[PDB]
Write a protein that binds this ligand. Structure first.
Ligand SMILES: *[C@@H]1O[C@H](CO)[C@@H](O)[C@H](O)[C@H]1NC(C)=O
Ligand SMILES: *[C@@H]1O[C@H](CO)[C@@H](O)[C@H](O)[C@H]1NC(C)=O
Ligand SMILES: CCOC(=O)CC(C)=O
Lengths: 269, 269
């Protein structure tokens, strides 16, 4: 169990993550009103949420998402969509760690992700800062599903400590680095990271710990089944880097579980 | 609003339909249990249900589905899969009728449906009859979603009146023919036919009345949101051939609402 307020927060951002796939904005003009096909993001629509900046396949990592202004909830939101073929993306997924100490002393992160964000980070970091200035009392949030989960975490750890707090809600995001980094994201100030996992989902389990990867604490694990609705009594906050008894169990994984984070995600109807 | 019992029957066959897709049926040993991936058919798995005859691309219209024995609910189920790609299927839908007086007089049903069914009625009726025999007490039920529900209203009135009753549960099925044929199913006996519709489902709106098509009565219409759970109150009964109030209203049909009958259907996570 977690608070209702936190539950609402998790649901709302699982929907922002989702919109990264099912909103019709691949080229949509900044200013339009955010919407999704297949009831993928209702709480998002209900709100006065508009696009500020949309974006596709950006630079070296082929990165997509959008930057929104939510006047109802007073949010500046940056969303990272995941792969358009998550089953693939999973099979192609190397476990290569590149070092990154510009971010943190000794921290070893995934080569792939880190490389992709770093190659876009400026053109965007400016864009957030822009709105933070435009709306100083608005909370800045980054969110993402699967891959997009991985990114927003990175972009998160990488942009805080600059003036405004940056919150991060990742859904079924994979490991991003070594026990150093795990710790950096576990304690780091200037924001809070909400790492949400569903059941056995197969991504929060890769790359493996065998390969030097570790998971930051804590973990909000959704116990409810795939396709089952989520209540605040179905989430267990799991404490301690790489704790078990959450998503991280020795049991057999699943790929659908990935696509069910408080609703349909990583795919559009 | 339906009774709790009917609801359970609706949910059960909605899942047997999904199972025509998300099961790992293909051709697998007769006598093997039934299971679906992505929690597409929990209630079916929950039942002591096994395959009796699987078929992949049988005859003229590459007909696909399976014949199941359910000792828990005492059923002989014949589930008809819909198209492998429902967008391309809707798109290329051919609208030509063809007589089928040997089902009923002055009866013209969609050409390709009737023709695909026809090819198999002999290999199929033979399996049903075979199972009806061992399990005389068991209730025979035909079910399906989309092109699958269609093929099941047509093997429906064709194989009816032959000793055993045949119930038909259809999930967002298209019109299967001309009005002489509409009126028939509406009041044939030795088997009720529950035609089910979800909000603005695009498929039960084809072919259109314009091309000489009629929908039978009554209509069980789920009016709850796409990806919302269904309660007993979200189902409304709709009488009158080609009546309106359920799915057959004048507003934009949605393809997504076609994929949500109680549980994700016509697509597998
Ligand atoms: C944008 O949303 C507002 C409600 O917040 C609505 O009044 C307005 O008509 C919408 N405009 C567009 C283009 O969607
Ligand atoms: C299949 O289900 C039946 C009854 O539900 C059970 O007796 C049998 O052991 C099961 N077999 C497998 C492989 O699940
Ligand atoms: C098991 C296959 O699932 C997927 O890859 C889902 C998707 C469209 O991304």
């Amino acid at each position: 169990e977690v608070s209702q307020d936190l539950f609402n927060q998790f649901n709302l951002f699982a929907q922002y993550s989702a919109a990264a796939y099912c909103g019709k904005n691949n080229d949509a003009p900044a200013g339009t009103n955010i919407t999704c096909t297949g009831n993928a993001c209702p709480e998002v629509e209900k709100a006065d949420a508009t696009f500020l900046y949309s974006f596709e396949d950006s630079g070296v990592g082929d990165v997509t998402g959008f930057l929104a202004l939510d006047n109802t909830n007073k949010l500046i939101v940056l969303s990272f969509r995941g792969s358009r073929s998550i089953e693939n993306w999973i099979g192609n997924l190397n476990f290569d760690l590149k070092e990154i100490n510009d971010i943190c002393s000794g921290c070893r992160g995934h080569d792939g992700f880190t490389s992709s964000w770093r190659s876009v980070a400026d053109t965007l970091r400016q864009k957030v800062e822009d709105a933070v200035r435009e709306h100083p009392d608005y909370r800045v949030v980054f969110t993402g599903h699967s891959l997009g989960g991985a990114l927003a975490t990175v972009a998160g750890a990488d942009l805080r400590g600059n003036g405004y707090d940056i919150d991060v809600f990742s859904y079924g995001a994979p490991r991003v680095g070594n026990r150093a980094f795990a710790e950096f994201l576990t304690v780091q100030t200037g924001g809070t990271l909400y790492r949400i996992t569903h059941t056995n989902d197969i991504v929060p389990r890769l790359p493996p710990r065998e390969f030097g990867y570790s998971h930051s604490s804590p973990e909000y694990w959704i116990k409810s089944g795939t396709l089952v609705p989520v209540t605040r009594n179905d989430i267990v906050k799991i404490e301690g880097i790489d704790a078990t008894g959450g998503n991280n169990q020795p049991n057999i994984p699943d790929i659908p579980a990935h696509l069910w984070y408080f609703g349909l995600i990583g795919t559009c109807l």
